[PDB]
Amino acid sequence: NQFYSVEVGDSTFTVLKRYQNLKPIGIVCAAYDAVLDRNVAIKKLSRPFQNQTHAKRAYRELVLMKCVNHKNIISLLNVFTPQKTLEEFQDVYLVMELMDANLCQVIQMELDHERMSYLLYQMLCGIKHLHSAGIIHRDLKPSNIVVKSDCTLKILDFGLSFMMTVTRYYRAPEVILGMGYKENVDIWSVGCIMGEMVRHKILFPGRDYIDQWNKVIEQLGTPCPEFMKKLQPTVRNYVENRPKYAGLTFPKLFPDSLFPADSEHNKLKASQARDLLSKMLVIDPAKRISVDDALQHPYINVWYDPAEVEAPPPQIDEREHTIEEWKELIYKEVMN
Ligand SMILES: O=C1/C(=N\O)c2c(/C=C/c3ccccc3)cccc2N1Cc1cc(F)cc2c1OCOC2
């Protein structure tokens, strides 16, 4: 038999013999791959076909992980199921390179500007590749971003009904207000992350989209009139009748306190980081900086490489099925 089973905490893992000494890291395991002779991460999807939300995402993430090729987006080293037939078909295991930590953990660190900006440079390279392929993520968050000791970074998922068992802090106002979006919907999320790196607190926490929007304008202020104009009457109504805020300026929103700023170098960088933050954390997407300009930004452009920025975009969903059709679709993919 090519497979063996072991329990991890609450779950059974039934994987190829090459993978050993599995350890829980998220449901995901780190493991040693004897064939490649390096460590990998192994994600187990149980019955991803159990419902249309799960099924769509599992399927979508499968097609993409496999035709997208860029160092800032996760790549699959291997996909398998232990089950032998479509009828027996139950689980999917995705195998990728192992890094060292989530972005949440990095975020809890005091980071120099060289690392903070390299991280952000990479997020933007990743997001830029996605967009060139027609993929607007719309749900970048730290928990789907991973980092290696050498500061290298990968985005783990490809972004956006009901389920029976999710973080929206990082979602743009155009997503929250459900209002039509373009590529720079993702700049917003990078900005919440960047902001969170600095302030070390989640920028806009909320029990739900009401809270959340309240947290947004509490600090950035009510959006201008032109922004309201692109809101549905129903949404626009509710938004124009929310209590108003002047807004705080950015030096106030991110005081000098928060910034490495003891050398001249670090003082100039602090100024540059805050300038970029102020350009990303902008409610009106018509005024928010785009991806290309953020890569051009002095804080960011020290890392700029045409190979990483301007890479061939992937050749390539948006669909609906029953449990059984989803199951065969996924099985077909897993088998090729
Ligand atoms: O590097 C990853 C990773 N995949 O590489 C990783 C994954 C991989 C997910 C995945 C998604 C789709 C396909 C294949 C794998 C999930 C969660 C964390 C990951 N981490 C962070 C991580 C690495 C460790 F070696 C140890 C820990 C780490 O984080 C928490 O603390 C313990």
From Swiss-Prot:
Recorded superkingdom: Eukaryota
Catalytic activity of the protein: L-seryl-[protein] + ATP = O-phospho-L-seryl-[protein] + ADP + H(+); L-threonyl-[protein] + ATP = O-phospho-L-threonyl-[protein] + ADP + H(+)
Documented EC number(s): 2.7.11.24
Keyword terms: ATP-binding, Biological rhythms, Chromosomal rearrangement, Cytoplasm, Epilepsy, Intellectual disability, Kinase, Lipoprotein, Membrane, Mitochondrion, Nucleotide-binding, Nucleus, Palmitate, Phosphoprotein, Serine/threonine-protein kinase, Transferase
Modified residues (Phosphothreonine): T165
Binding residue positions for ATP: K43
Family: Belongs to the protein kinase superfamily. CMGC Ser/Thr protein kinase family. MAP kinase subfamily.
Listed name of the protein: Mitogen-activated protein kinase 10
Lineage start: Eukaryota, Metazoa, Chordata, Craniata, Vertebrata
Full protein segment contained here: 46 to 400 of 464
